[PDB]
Symmetry: D2
Subunit: 231 residues, 4 copies
């Protein structure tokens, strides 16, 4: 179980981030949701996760492109819960175009959400995790964090950077009970397995890396791509 | 829960393999132990594990250097249980010495146990798993499958070899409901920023996960458990 | 030789970038220099490289943090020389501090020079290279583009992203006679070799990847770290 | 210019190894050829290469499966030239078949030629290079040392094995003036976004570079020449 523990999951209003929220909720953790969503959808999902967690579930709308707003969520968490115990970064935007025609606006935007946000999100979560002497940081990347595909430059570039970000931080905090890891999924609903990875599966992996058994797994990436990177 | 499911585990009379044999046993799986040890020890361990599982637990003495013996153990499994559902390769030997003084004798032995044995082991397991449309192959390698170190040449070449084997076999069987992965532990209590020994229970918990149904989309990959070793 | 060919080398006023400029000059290519430097130093070095190249050597002061200024150099090159034939990215800044105390100003700055600049620099160089049906893009990264070290997060993150950037672009332009590659040096004046890599050595590698023999080497990284990453 | 320098090259009676033997020959190096081929062919090739080098060119028939024969060729080199300055492993065999139908016979053969032979080859070369304080070991592997493919299990495990061996030996000899690297070619004209065959001259140019003095700080690493293969 995950009682008293508090989890902050960016991009958790839909798909993977949401699937992760539901599992960590079933296990009794407090969940801070986040991300784009019509008011109707934000309340629906928020009340849905709430009805799973014995703890406190609540949503925060920090735009991952605004480092100031991200500090808000990171600060309100320190206040409300006394620091996040689990930090999973799932916020991610995309855009496909060949580099020589890739909007600079789109580049800066993709790097903000797919890379820099994890920075702002981690730099804020670390201190309380150090003090408490325990922590779990789990970045949701992608196969494109290990290998590339054409016309996805900004994307690919950010997942590779997230790799390096993970490796560094993990070293920095190795001796503090905190682990920093990455999950690289394939096509979630090139893949030898010929099947979509389901958000429920991806979530189970997150759940594992959060357990105390995965204390000695740090600074690494776990590929779940059905044999994608195996070639 | 692994009730009904059968697990073969090489080098499980001690250390990591044993921890994993125990974990799978508590889950209901039949276990086939394998490995070195005096007769007295072999039966002590075999009971130990049996005492946990409501299924059948027994030991096979196949020598990982003698592929025909591996072949027999694999044959016995197919007959007794209709083939292993889970297969974990943990058998491994070591020999430290700079390469120019490294005994050919020793290179040949390490390669046989650390690399070739998984070939012989997998070849006999793939058909049954294919027929049943489900399977789990978990090769216990090391962080040395990713990075190297001086004086462990045969050991390092073997682990890296297992890497390529894992990838390959995964691709071959990706559409048959079988997964094929590798666990890459660091210094285990039988270069680590974590400054803590990896426990055998820890490694076994990772094995238990990959055997589960959730881990069906994890295949042809490695998972380092080295407390940060490879991150640098 | 490299006659009529034009090379653009960011961060080429000192050290590695400069060493590369000197070799491509000895081989008769036009060289566009770039980077920080007192007027005295800019003229000294510019006249030094000039006196090596049978072609035209000239310096451009685009601040790698200003995507608009980078376009300038990329545009003036298309005008003056009809597109850069070789593009090596060597511009790089650094800052050491543990993540939870890492100035956001410093993060954004490091990503600008170490990562985003290569984007702006490449998106501008590609079209003329495609048209001409030949090209060589060589990103100077570092061992930290493959492995990590503590308190160098922004840095590490950028070199890993440069990895992914390289892999993508290389795929995009595979069939156009252009190759995109990365060089990852160790400590240039952890290393089993116990010796500093010299800028002259790093340069020789750049020179090779520029030859026609290295046409089939694309989307890859060449580690020159004296055994650093071998462990 | 490699005048005075001696190069041993396994599997150089054709293909990549031959291209590399030629390149080093034009540079002034003594060459020791090795590999399969009818008698008529062996001497034709040996002349061909000799005709380029002002140094001594000759061929040794060591069978890469018989380590004692490798040992003799290595011994003959130490006596004739006082040890190889450059050593490139290019000998390699293939066998395509899904693993459950993969002949043990064949697994053993591929592993011997593609992996173990470099062990035996390197062990006899390291001492002389150490004494002279300079050396170049260039293992010609493949893109399969990085990624896998179905039905090439022994081949893939062997290349990955060479990877780990290269890393290890590099670390062992890093301070002795010797470098140990790997070239990882793609489809060579004897999955590629470049849609062009890698030529043997191309691969040989990369070998020539790594042998040079400039490439002294490149060690324990791989260089893929696959036109993009591994980038995806």
């Amino acid at each position: 179980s995950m009682m008293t523990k508090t989890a902050v999951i960016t991009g958790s209003t839909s798909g993977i981030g949401l699937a992760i929220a539901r599992t960590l909720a079933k296990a009794g953790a407090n969940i801070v949701l986040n991300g784009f969503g019509a008011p109707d959808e934000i309340r629906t999902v928020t009340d849905e996760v709430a009805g799973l967690s014995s703890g406190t579930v609540l949503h925060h709308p920090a735009d991952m492109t605004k480092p100031s707003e991200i500090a808000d969520m990171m600060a309100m968490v320190a206040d409300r819960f006394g620091g996040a115990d689990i930090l999973v970064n799932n916020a991610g935007v995309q855009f496909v175009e060949k580099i020589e025609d890739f909007p600079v606006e789109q580049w800066d935007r993709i790097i903000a959400v797919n890379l820099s946000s994890s920075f702002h999100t981690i730099r804020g979560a670390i201190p309380p995790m150090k003090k408490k002497g325990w922590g779990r940081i789990i970045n949701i990347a992608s196969a494109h964090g290990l290998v590339a595909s054409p016309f996805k430059s900004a994307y690919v570039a950010a997942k590779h950077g997230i790799m390096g970000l993970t490796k560094t931080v993990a070293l920095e905090v190795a001796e503090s009970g905190v682990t920093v890891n990455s999950i690289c999924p394939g096509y979630v609903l090139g893949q030898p397995t010929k099947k979509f990875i389901t958000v429920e599966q991806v979530a189970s992996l997150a759940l594992y890396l959060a357990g105390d058994d995965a204390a000695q797994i740090t600074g690494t990436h776990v590929s779940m791509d059905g044999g994608w990177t195996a070639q």
